[PDB]
Amino acid sequence: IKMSPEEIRAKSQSYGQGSDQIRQILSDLTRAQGEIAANWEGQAFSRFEEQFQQLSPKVEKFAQLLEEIKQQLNSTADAVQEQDQ
């Protein structure tokens, strides 16, 4: 009546894919941010830049958390299976 190892393993994959995709978006859009900012005079873009730079470490930290949950879920599914045997 709790989650099976089978299901925990599959949920883990969703966290892993979530981590990878957030990291890839952050990478691509960091490059875009730099190019836009470098080409735009005056401060029309300045607040967007400031907010992006403040939020990006938190988004990176979240992506790493998702990968840490994925790993923990795989270890837990393993553990459940070991008891079941």
Instruction: Kindly write out the interface string for residues 9-28 of this chain, putting x where it contacts a second copy by CB under 8 A and - elsewhere.
Output: --x--xx--x--xx--x--x
Q: How far is the C-alpha of 51 from the C-alpha of 15, rounded, in Å?
A: 26
Q: What is the DSSP letter of 15?
A: H
**35 scored as a contact of a second copy (CB under 8 A):** yes
Contact call for residues 33 and 49 (beta carbons, < 8 A) = yes
Does residue 5 contact residue 81 with C-beta atoms inside 8 Å? yes
Question: Is residue 20 close enough to count as binding Zn ion by CB under 5 A?
Answer: yes
- Binding residues vs a second copy (CB under 8 A): 1-3, 11, 14-15, 18, 21-22, 25, 28-29, 32, 35-36, 39-45, 48, 51-52, 55-56, 58-59, 61-62, 65-66, 68-69, 72-73, 76
